[PDB]
C-alpha cells in the first residue's frame, strides 16, 4: 500500500460534505451499537479486509502487509459479517455483553471518482477509542480505503469495499470485538 492516489482537482464541496456526513452518521451507528442499521449499509458483494502489518527493513518494505493469500485480522464477505452481527447483538456474546464504549473520530477525508457512476474511492483517517468494563482502554489508529456507492438509505451511501490499514504490528488489544 502506497500514498493514496488523490485527484489533482479536489472533489466538489457538496460531494466532500456528503461523504464526510456519511462517515459521521456511520460512526454514530457504531458508537451507539446500532449494528443492524450499520450492517444494512453493507452491499451483498462487500469485501471487508484488514491485513497484517509487519516490521520490515527499508529494502524489504514491499512485504510490509499480508497479501490476499495470507492470514489477516479481517477478511470478510456479507455472509461472514452477518454471523458477526448475530454474535455481537447476542445476549450470550460475552465479549460484548456488557458491551464496550467506543468512539470513532473520523477526519482526513479524500474523495476520488471511479469509472463507475455514483461510485467513489474514499480515503480517511481514524482514531478508535475503545473503553471496556472497569479500566480497559484500547486506542486504535489507521486509515480506511473504501469503495462507496450512492444508495437510497438514511445515510446516503452504501459500502461496497473496505480495507482498514491499522497502525500496529502486534495488536496491543486482547481482541477486535469492534467494527472499523
Amino acid at each position: 500500500f502506497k500514498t493514496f492516489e488523490w485527484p489533482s482537482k479536489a472533489a466538489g464541496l457538496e460531494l466532500q460534505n456528503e461523504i464526510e456526513q456519511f462517515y459521521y452518521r456511520e460512526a454514530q451507528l457504531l458508537d451507539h451499537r446500532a449494528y443492524e442499521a450499520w450492517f444494512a449499509l453493507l452491499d451483498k458483494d462487500i469485501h471487508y479486509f484488514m491485513p497484517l502489518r509487519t516490521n520490515r527493513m527499508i529494502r524489504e518494505g514491499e512485504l510490509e502487509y499480508s497479501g490476499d493469500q495470507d492470514l489477516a485480522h479481517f477478511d470478510e464477505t456479507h455472509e461472514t459479517m452477518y454471523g458477526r452481527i448475530r454474535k455481537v447483538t447476542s445476549d450470550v456474546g460475552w465479549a460484548e455483553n456488557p458491551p464496550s464504549r467506543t468512539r470513532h473520530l473520523v477526519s482526513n477525508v479524500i474523495v476520488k471518482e471511479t469509472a463507475t457512476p455514483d461510485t467513489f474511492e474514499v480515503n480517511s483517517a481514524f482514531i478508535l477509542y475503545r473503553n471496556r468494563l472497569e479500566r480497559q482502554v484500547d486506542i486504535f489508529a489507521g486509515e480506511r480505503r473504501d469503495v462507496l456507492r450512492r444508495a437510497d438509505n438514511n445515510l446516503g451511501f452504501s459500502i461496497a469495499k473496505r480495507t482498514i490499514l491499522l497502525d500496529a504490528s502486534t495488536l496491543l488489544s486482547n481482541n477486535l470485538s469492534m467494527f472499523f
Binding site: 447476542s90 468494563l133 481482541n175 477486535l176 470485538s177
Partner: protein, 433 residues
C-alpha cells in the same frame, strides 16, 4: 523463598486441587523462566516459514528473543537475538532474507549461522570470536513444526513428546506431501497467565460444550438455523500423555461442532473422501480412527497449542505472570486443493484471529480471571480440577494412551503435575520419562 516442599503443595492431582497463586506470583514466574522455559522444547514455527537459504524468523523462547534461520545445508539454526558485546538486537525485523547479520551499535558482523565473523578494529583494540557468539539452542523438527531447547541435558524431542506423537500426526501426517503454513503470523496481547491458555487447549472442551462459545457457533451456523438445531456435541474422548503434561480432547461422530466452525467443505474433506481415507490408512496402525475425530484441541507442554480439525496453531509467549502474547498461524496439507486451502484460511480468520468469533470469548474469560487474582481472598482457596478423576484408562478399545471422557480434567491434572515436577526437580535424571 520457594522450597521444593512448598512447590509440591501447589498442585495436587490426587485431590484435584490447584493453588491460584501459580497464575499470579512473581517469584514463581521468574522460576518458570529458568526451570520450565529454560529447558523445554518450545515451538518457534514451521519449516515453510524459512524455506530458502538465509531466510529468517524473529520469534521468542519465553522472554528471550530468538532468530530461527535456514542454513546452506538445509538445516535450521536457532540463536539468541542478542549481541554479546553490550546486548543490542542483531536481527531487528520480523522476517525476511539475510546474507549476514550486523549489530547496529558497534558493527559486530555475524553470518547466518550465528557465528561472529568480524569485529571492527579487532587487531587494533583487542579475545576470540568463536567464544563470543550468541547462545545457540538445540533445534529439532517434528513433521514440519520446528521446536527449540536451550538445555543440552534435556531429552530429545521424540522422547519429550512420547505417546502424544500419534495425536500430533492427526494434523501433521495425513498425506506423504506433509503440511505447509499459510502466510502471515497473527500477534496480539492478552492480560492473563500462559497456563490458562495452555490448559484450555490441553483439557478444556468443557468451555466450548457449555457457555463460552454459544455466540461463536451462532456466527457459524446458517442464517435460517438457530442454537436449537446447531446440534449439541456430547460424545467424545480426552487423552493424557504418559510423560510431559501433553493433552488432547476431541468429539466423536457428532459433526455439529466442526460444521459450524469450519463449514461444509472442510468437514467433508476431513471425514469423507480420498484424503480422509488416506489418513485412515496412514494412521490406522497407531490404533486411532481419525475419520471419527471431529473437532480437536491439543497442547504440547508448555506453550505449543493447536486445533487439529481446524488446523489452528499458536504459541503463547509469557510476558510476566499477568500477560501473554499470542502468536498464531495456520497449517494446510501441502497437496490439498486450492478450494480447501482457501476455506481453511477464511474460517481461521473468522474464528481464531484477534477479532475471531471464538477467540473473542476465549480471551474475555482469561482477562477477568487474571484481574480477580489480584485480591487476597481470591487466591486463598484452591481451584477445582476434580473433573473425571479416577475415570481414565490406558486400555481404551478406541484410542491409545490414557483415555477418558471429553468433558474431564485428566489432561489438565497431568499438565499442572508435570509443571510442578519441572519446577521442583532441578536435574533431568529424575525428571526424564
Amino acid at each position: 523463598n520457594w522450597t521444593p516442599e512448598a512447590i509440591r503443595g501447589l498442585v495436587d492431582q490426587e485431590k484435584g486441587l490447584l493453588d491460584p497463586r501459580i497464575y499470579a506470583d512473581q517469584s514463581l514466574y521468574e522460576l518458570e523462566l529458568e526451570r520450565v522455559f529454560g529447558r523445554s522444547w518450545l515451538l518457534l514455527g514451521h519449516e515453510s516459514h524459512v524455506p530458502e537459504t538465509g531466510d529468517f524468523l524473529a520469534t521468542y523462547m519465553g522472554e528471550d528473543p530468538v532468530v530461527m534461520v535456514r542454513q546452506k545445508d538445509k538445516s535450521i539454526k536457532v540463536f539468541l537475538n542478542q549481541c554479546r558485546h553490550r546486548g543490542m538486537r542483531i536481527c531487528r525485523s520480523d522476517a525476511g532474507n539475510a546474507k549476514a547479520f550486523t549489530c547496529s551499535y558497534h558493527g559486530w558482523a555475524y553470518d547466518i549461522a550465528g557465528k561472529l565473523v568480524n569485529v571492527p578494529f579487532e587487531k587494533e583494540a583487542f579475545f576470540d570470536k568463536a567464544e563470543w557468539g550468541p547462545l545457540q539452542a538445540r533445534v529439532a523438527t517434528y513433521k514440519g513444526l520446528v521446536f527449540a531447547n536451550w538445555d543440552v541435558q534435556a531429552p530429545d524431542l521424540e522422547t519429550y513428546l512420547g505417546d502424544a506423537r500419534p495425536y500430533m500426526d492427526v494434523m501433521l501426517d495425513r498425506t506423504p506431501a506433509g503440511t505447509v503454513a499459510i502466510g502471515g503470523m497473527q500477534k496480539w496481547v492478552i492480560p492473563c497467565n500462559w497456563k490458562f491458555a495452555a490448559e484450555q487447549f490441553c483439557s478444556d472442551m468443557y468451555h466450548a460444550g457449555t457457555t463460552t462459545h454459544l455466540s461463536g457457533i451462532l456466527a457459524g451456523i446458517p442464517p435460517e438455523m438457530d442454537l436449537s438445531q446447531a446440534q449439541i456435541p456430547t460424545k467424545g474422548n480426552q487423552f493424557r500423555a504418559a510423560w510431559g503434561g501433553h493433552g488432547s480432547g476431541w468429539y466423536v461422530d457428532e459433526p455439529g461442532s466442526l460444521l459450524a466452525v469450519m463449514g461444509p467443505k472442510v468437514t467433508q474433506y476431513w471425514t469423507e473422501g480420498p484424503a480422509a481415507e488416506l489418513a485412515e490408512q496412514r494412521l490406522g496402525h497407531t490404533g486411532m480412527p481419525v475419520r471419527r475425530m471431529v473437532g480437536q484441541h491439543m497442547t504440547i507442554f508448555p506453550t505449543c497449542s493447536f486445533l487439529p480439525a481446524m488446523n489452528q496453531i499458536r504459541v503463547w509467549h509469557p510476558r510476566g505472570p499477568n500477560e501473554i502474547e499470542v502468536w498464531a498461524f495456520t497449517l494446510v496439507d501441502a497437496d490439498a486443493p486450492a478450494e480447501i486451502k482457501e476455506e481453511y484460511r477464511r474460517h481461521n480468520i473468522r474464528n481464531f484471529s484477534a477479532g475471531g468469533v471464538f477467540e473473542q470469548d476465549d480471551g474475555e474469560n482469561w482477562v477477568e480471571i487474571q484481574k480477580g487474582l489480584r485480591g487476597y481472598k481470591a487466591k486463598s482457596q484452591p481451584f477445582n480440577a476434580q473433573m473425571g478423576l479416577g475415570r481414565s484408562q490406558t486400555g481404551h478399545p478406541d484410542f491409545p494412551g490414557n483415555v477418558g471422557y471429553v468433558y474431564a480434567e485428566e489432561a489438565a491434572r497431568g499438565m499442572y503435575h508435570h509443571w510442578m515436577r519441572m519446577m521442583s526437580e532441578p536435574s533431568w535424571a529424575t525428571l526424564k520419562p
